[PDB]
Ligand binder design. Structure first.
Ligand SMILES: Nc1ncnc2c1ncn2[C@@H]1O[C@H](COP(=O)(O)OP(=O)(O)O)[C@@H](O)[C@H]1O
Ligand SMILES: Nc1ncnc2c1ncn2[C@@H]1O[C@H](COP(=O)(O)OP(=O)(O)O)[C@@H](O)[C@H]1O
Ligand SMILES: Cc1cn([C@H]2C[C@H](N=[N+]=[N-])[C@@H](COP(=O)(O)O)O2)c(=O)[nH]c1=O
Ligand SMILES: Cc1cn([C@H]2C[C@H](N=[N+]=[N-])[C@@H](COP(=O)(O)O)O2)c(=O)[nH]c1=O
Ligand SMILES: [Mg+2]
Ligand SMILES: [Mg+2]
Ligand SMILES: [Mg+2]
Lengths: 210, 210
């Protein structure tokens, strides 16, 4: 069975990741592919509720612990992800390990190396779209929500970390100009996605950061 | 303020860790030290209940996720541990990161390196007592409980991992002959502990595996 592609959407807050993830799954299915949507954090599981509570500022969680929970929340969906991809379903994922390193990496005294480790070995994405746009334009998209990390200084430090993670060519990173219109951004991501789906069927699923 | 020592007790199942941890805290306090007992997993927290449920076989948890939860369960007590040690309290801990690597490391395809990473940076123990005894003698101590990992093959593979972790001299490992009587083993551990308490007051608390 021809495997599906693992596609990840990354980017700062308000970059359009959730809107484009949804629209990408709808377009791929309308085009005859079997595609499904996933997101991280996956807030429906027991670890997911601890995470959701933390982000809603309803609870405080020690920073290394919260980093590890974000990773475990990915490992708990790995058996499903592998199962689906091997069945031929392409998965479109709104945030993944990159967000996990970039957001904890924005906290002082958290090295990029330490942050990466828990995620070493996850399914390696076939494509990582980075939805680029000036944090200034992003701010034009209404106001900041009330969740943890939803402020300018934190976003700025996470973008810097994302810039470090892009210097790793082992991954198929693709920059997307997220400043355009929802439909324009969508057309770009769809075209990149169709190309990746075609090629993923040729090489086995690899492991991240290893 | 003269800091307290961080003492860890490690060893296989039924080696006497809980009995000796308790008795060690009682003896140190009777001898005029301020000492308190801790254990891992710490089953009282939200992560702790997920862990307890897993070990009671009431739930199944994906292996990398469960490994990370075991680590987070340590990081969530780090602010307390540091606070207490700096106040002059010696902490006696029944299991720590070593058990975290040795038990996950007993599962196929989990490298010692990957297992260590989440715990990199924890408070470094001043003393790590390893309660040594033949798995055969341990089995004489009644029967195996009904928790996960409580079987011969798994214990055997964890002991091998513990043997690897002892090859790291960066840590103050001390072997204890756990085959003796409860009081005899106790006298050995107490004497080693008093010596470590005296010296911890001279050097700052270090970080584990880094
Ligand atoms: N290309 C775009 N242009 C203008 N507004 C956009 C665009 N993409 C998304 N939006 C709006 O910006 C807000 C954030 O979009 P969303 O997809 O939720 O971003 P993310 O998931 O990156 O936080 C939403 O109100 C959305 O409608
Ligand atoms: N030195 C010893 N000799 C004989 N029995 C012992 C000794 N130490 C502990 N025991 C008994 O063995 C069992 C396991 O001891 P415990 O301290 O709970 O071990 P652990 O916490 O390593 O599993 C308990 O019933 C305990 O009373
Ligand atoms: C997947 C993931 C998300 N995050 C963050 C990014 C987001 N905060 N901001 N900005 C937050 C919520 O994600 P969404 O914006 O996709 O709902 O979780 C982490 O901190 N670690 C992780 O592993
Ligand atoms: C602290 C710790 C314990 N463990 C295990 C060792 C034990 N199973 N066995 N044998 C189990 C319960 O610990 P106690 O035996 O101390 O109750 O948790 C891990 O698997 N990872 C960890 O990080
Ligand atoms: Mg979103
Ligand atoms: Mg015990
Ligand atoms: Mg390394």
């Amino acid at each position: 069975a021809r495997r599906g592609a693992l596609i990840v959407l990354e980017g700062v807050d308000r970059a359009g990741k959730s809107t484009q993830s949804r629209k990408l799954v709808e377009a791929l299915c309308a085009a005859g592919h079997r595609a499904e949507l996933l997101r991280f954090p996956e807030r429906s599981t027991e670890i997911g509720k601890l995470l959701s509570s933390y982000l809603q500022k309803k609870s405080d969680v020690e920073d290394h612990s919260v980093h590890l929970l974000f990773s475990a929340n990915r490992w708990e969906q790995v058996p499903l992800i592998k199962e689906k991809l091997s069945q031929g379903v392409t998965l479109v994922v709104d945030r993944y390990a990159f967000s996990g390193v970039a957001y904890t990496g924005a906290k002082e005294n958290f090295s990029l190396d330490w942050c990466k480790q828990p995620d070493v070995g996850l399914p390696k994405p076939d494509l990582v779209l980075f939805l680029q746009l000036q944090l200034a334009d992003a701010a034009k998209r209404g106001a900041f929500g009330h969740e943890r990390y939803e402020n300018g200084a934190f976003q700025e430090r996470a973008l810097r970390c994302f810039h470090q993670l892009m210097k790793d060519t082992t991954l198929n990173w693709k920059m997307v100009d997220a400043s355009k219109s929802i439909e324009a951004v969508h057309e770009d991501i769809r075209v990149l996605s169709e190309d990746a789906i075609a090629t993923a069927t040729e090489k086995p699923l690899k492991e991240l950061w290893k």
